[PDB]
Amino acid sequence: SLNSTGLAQAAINGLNARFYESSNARWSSDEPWWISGVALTMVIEYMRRSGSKEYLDQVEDVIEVQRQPLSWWPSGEGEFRADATDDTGWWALAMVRMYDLTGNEDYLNISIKDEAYMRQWWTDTECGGGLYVDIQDLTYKNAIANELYLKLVASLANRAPNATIYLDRAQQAWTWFLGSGMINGVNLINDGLARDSNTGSCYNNRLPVWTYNQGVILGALVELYHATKDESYLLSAQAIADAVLSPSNGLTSSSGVLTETCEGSDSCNQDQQVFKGVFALNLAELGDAVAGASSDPDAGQDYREYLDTNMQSMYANDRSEIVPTLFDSSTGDLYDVSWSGPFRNATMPKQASAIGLYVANI
Numbered sequence: 065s066l067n068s069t070g071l072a073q074a075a076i077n078g079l080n081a082r083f084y085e086s087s088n089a090r091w092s093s094d095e096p097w098w099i100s101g102v103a104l105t106m107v108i109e110y111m112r113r114s115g116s117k118e119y120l121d122q123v124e125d126v127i128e129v130q131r132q133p134l135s136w137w138p139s140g141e142g143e144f145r146a147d148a149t150d151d152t153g154w155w156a157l158a159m160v161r162m163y164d165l166t167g168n169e170d171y172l173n174i175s176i177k178d179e180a181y182m183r184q185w186w187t188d189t190e191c192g193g194g195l196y197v198d199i200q201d202l203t204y205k206n207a208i209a210n211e212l213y214l215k216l217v218a219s220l221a222n223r224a225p226n227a228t229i230y231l232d233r234a235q236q237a238w239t240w241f242l243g244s245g246m247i248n249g250v251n252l253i254n255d256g257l258a259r260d261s262n263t264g265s266c267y268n269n270r271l272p273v274w275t276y277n278q279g280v281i282l283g284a285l286v287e288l289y290h291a292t293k294d295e296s297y298l299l300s301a302q303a304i305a306d307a308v309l310s311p312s313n314g315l316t317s318s319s320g321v322l323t324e325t326c327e328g329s330d331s332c333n334q335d336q337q338v339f340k341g342v343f344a345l346n347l348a349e350l351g352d353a354v355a356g357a358s359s360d361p362d363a364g365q366d367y368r369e370y371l372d373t374n375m376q377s378m379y380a381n382d383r384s385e386i387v388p389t390l391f392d393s394s395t396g397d398l399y400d401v402s403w404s405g406p407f408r409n410a411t412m413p414k415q416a417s418a419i420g421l422y423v424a425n426i
């Protein structure tokens with residue numbers, strides 16, 4: 065059979081060999097900055113699950129440089145406070161996992177600063193709650209920025225000293241999210257909310273169902289379950305995951321492979337190329353929590369076999385090994401966007417999603 069730990073290492077090595085920039089402490093500066101934060105999450109989570117510490121020096125290097133005040137948003141004063149609330153949220157959650165891996169309170173302190181910075185754009189006057197994604201414009205309350213923020217306060221409710229205020233915020237944020245309408249009739253989450261012209265009421269904007277908007281919410285509900293031991297949080301998360309796994313909903317192919325809607329038209333952009341790996345790792349979080357909340361041996365078996373099925377398909381159809389030279393000894397694996405499709409090229413967002421699926425099976 066396949067060993068997920070060794071393949072995640074080969075994928076991380078391929079990510080480093082092709083896309084890591086030593087002089088910048090960052091992967092692929094020609095790609096979105098927030099995807100470097102997702103890549104850091106993948107590498108950190110690989111270490112926690114595999115017990116290795118093989119990239120810890122590299123991770124601390126990336127952290128220390130990306131803490132600095134961003135050149136495109138100096139008013140954030142660094143600590144990953146960017147010009148978008150979801151950009152900040154990706155690095156904030158990576159710092160929660162960095163704290164989980166090392167126990168260094170420094171990384172939890174970043175997460176706390178990030179929560180307070182993100183909360184500045186939570187608003188009760190439009191849509192009765194939720195925060196904006198575009199800090200500069202304040203025109204869009206979308207699913208991903210509010211899912212990241214919800215997972216952040218739910219994580220801090222389990223780790224921070226003033227844990228009670230973060231629990232009240234997480235419980236209040238989930239209540240708003242559930243009543244927002246972004247969760248539709250088949251228990252899937254559209255992209256965000258639109259605002260009525262005359263009335264000012266908000267409603268599901270019916271924009272595409274992206275895989276990473278069905279994943280981050282699972283981790284948030286798992287963290288809310290850990291903070292409350294209320295299994296109804298796991299039940300809501302399971303209904304969202306079951307909808308993704310149902311081939312009738314168009315996200316799981318007839319082969320049982322997770323498929324982004326943009327893969328059909330071959331039009332997945334730099335953002336959408338990383339979505340699947342985010343869902344896979346969050347589904348592994350849901351599976352681990354489900355198996356720990358009951359005594360049935362097959363508890364969470366469907367989520368684990370789904371991750372295994374997607375691993376083997378992408379292992380077999382989406383992989384390409386880098387060829388070593390007389391000068392470069394680097395070895396590893398590269399991956400394209402489609403887990404059940406051909407390998408044409410490899411980009412950093414595609415590679416980061418790749419690692420997330422392997423780490424989800426460790």
Ligand SMILES: OC[C@H]1O[C@@H](O)[C@H](O)[C@@H](O)[C@@H]1O
Nearest residue numbers: 093095096097098136137147
């Ligand atoms: O505004 C979004 C930001 O995205 C990042 O990936 C880029 O590196 C910045 O130059 C840009 O300002």
Ligand SMILES: OC[C@H]1O[C@@H](O)[C@H](O)[C@@H](O)[C@@H]1O
Nearest residue numbers: 197206207208255274335336
């Ligand atoms: O690619 C899809 C993503 O595009 C971004 O510009 C939007 O802010 C997100 O809400 C959306 O999920």
Ligand SMILES: OC[C@H]1O[C@@H](O)[C@H](O)[C@@H](O)[C@@H]1O
Nearest residue numbers: 203204256257258259269271
């Ligand atoms: O790009 C997605 C669009 O979604 C709409 O629901 C929002 O009202 C816009 O502000 C946003 O730009």
